[PDB]
């Protein structure tokens, strides 16, 4: 009952070569067959690689598999990269009765500037604390790649209930846009310190922050 | 061409029951094993279940055990997910997939059918200000903002000072939340010098419960 780890997302530029990564958290690797699925966006997924490396007819051989047991990973490279190839991937493997996928990883082949999330935390309003409820509203706009996480502390402590995050948007001018929430009680907002939105693109966070006691 | 011809599907409320169709052709059915996947809206694929050519052999993971059955129809080239005591976890897009067996892999995968649980029902928003302070300003810039909670079914228009207000608007896609409620929020920018001059007003619609909000945003 393994699992199998690939990244939140890559990028590159077309005509470039990326690869993208996954790694079996227990057993080895090469003990079972991994395979790869392409899922572009609003579209039901298509097979890339079977077999670790085998190509279906019709995928052509920019879409490349292989495997690291020093790693315990399994990797899809594409060369060449074309927009036709933005989507996500996903791998899989099978043993005893259980099929598992990886969590899928976002594929932007870009085609303009990367842009770092601006990141605005607004804290529960008066008249919704007068209505017994709270929710702290985080708005991440104007970044690209269009992949983002969102985190939330309270005071220090990572939260793990009442969080609801939007999936990335394409905005008007081509960047993404996503938001978060945050459902608190009006005695839990007064009784922390601070809480805080953290949203990590590419590797580096950007974290806001409010207080109670403003 | 394979074809994987999908059907079924729709809307329920928990506890209720549904049955998914995956009609073929393009291969004799009797050949190969044959699988269930779904993908819950913005989430990764999950296996559903698999059946083995003839039936003898059937695997569930967990997360679906003791409710959902499949079963296929050889004769028919059509393979079935009967789902009962759904649950609001339960929405996703399911694909039906052919299988082959011993490369361990799905070859083909059919369109999808969407599966939705829910047991909310028309609700008119709950509008909050979001606004402006010391806290919400950067360089001479302040955000301010409307927060539009706990509606269903979709759409909300949002608009600012009537329509006189669209410089610097966005308003965000909804979060569909656990509650099975959405919420969204709409924010704008403005100089931080006209918060004493003018007025901020955020116009809500949402016509599925006949509810208009116009919410005045003022300054902390």
């Known amino acids: 009952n393994f699992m199998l780890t690939q990244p939140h997302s890559v990028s590159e530029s077309p005509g470039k070569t990326v690869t993208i990564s996954c790694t079996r958290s227990t057993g080895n690797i090469g003990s079972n067959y991994v395979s790869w699925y392409q899922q572009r966006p609003g579209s039901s997924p298509t097979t890339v690689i079977y077999?670790?490396?085998?190509?279906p007819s019709g995928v052509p051989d920019r879409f490349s598999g292989s495997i690291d047991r020093s790693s315990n990973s399994a990797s899809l490279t594409i060369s060449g990269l074309k927009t036709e190839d933005e989507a996500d991937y996903y791998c899989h493997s099978y043993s005893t009765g259980m099929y598992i996928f990886g969590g899928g990883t976002k594929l932007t082949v870009l085609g303009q500037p990367k842009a770092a999330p601006s990141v605005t935390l607004f804290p529960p309003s008066s008249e919704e604390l007068q209505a017994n409820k709270a929710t702290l509203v985080c708005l991440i706009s104007d970044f690209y790649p269009g992949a983002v996480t969102v985190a939330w502390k309270a005071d220090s402590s990572p939260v793990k209930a009442g969080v609801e995050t939007t999936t990335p948007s394409k905005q008007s001018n081509n960047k993404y846009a996503a938001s978060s929430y945050l459902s608190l009680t009006p005695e839990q907002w007064k009784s922390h310190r601070s809480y805080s939105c953290q949203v990590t693109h590419e590797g580096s966070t950007v974290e806001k922050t409010v207080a109670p006691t403003e | 061409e394979v074809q994987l011809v999908q059907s079924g599907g729709g809307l329920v409320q928990p506890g209720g029951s549904l049955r998914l169709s995956c009609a073929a052709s393009?291969?004799?059915?009797?050949?190969?094993?044959m699988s269930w996947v779904r993908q819950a809206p913005g989430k990764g694929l999950e296996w559903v279940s698999s059946?083995?050519?003839?039936?003898?052999?059937?695997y569930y993971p967990d997360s679906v055990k003791g409710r959902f059955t499949i079963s296929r129809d050889n004769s028919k080239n059509t393979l079935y997910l009967q789902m009962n005591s759904l649950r609001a976890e339960d929405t996703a897009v399911y694909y039906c997939?052919?299988?082959?067996?011993?490369?361990?892999?799905?070859?083909?995968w059919g369109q999808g059918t969407m599966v939705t649980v829910s047991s909310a029902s028309t609700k008119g928003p709950s509008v909050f200000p979001l606004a402006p302070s010391s806290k919400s300003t950067s360089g001479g810039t302040a955000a301010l903002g409307c927060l539009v909670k706990d509606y269903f079914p979709e759409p909300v228009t949002v608009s600012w000072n009537s329509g006189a207000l669209t410089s610097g608007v966005h308003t965000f896609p909804a979060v569909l939340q656990s509650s099975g409620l959405y919420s969204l929020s709409s924010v704008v920018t403005v100089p931080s010098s006209s918060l004493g001059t003018q007025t901020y007003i955020c116009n809500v619609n949402h016509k599925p419960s006949n509810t208009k909000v116009d919410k005045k945003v003022e300054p902390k």
């Open positions: 393009g291969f004799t059915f009797n050949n190969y094993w």
């Open positions: 059946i083995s050519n003839i039936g003898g052999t059937i």
């Open positions: 077999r670790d490396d085998q190509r």
């Open positions: 997939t052919r299988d082959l067996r011993m490369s361990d892999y799905f070859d083909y």
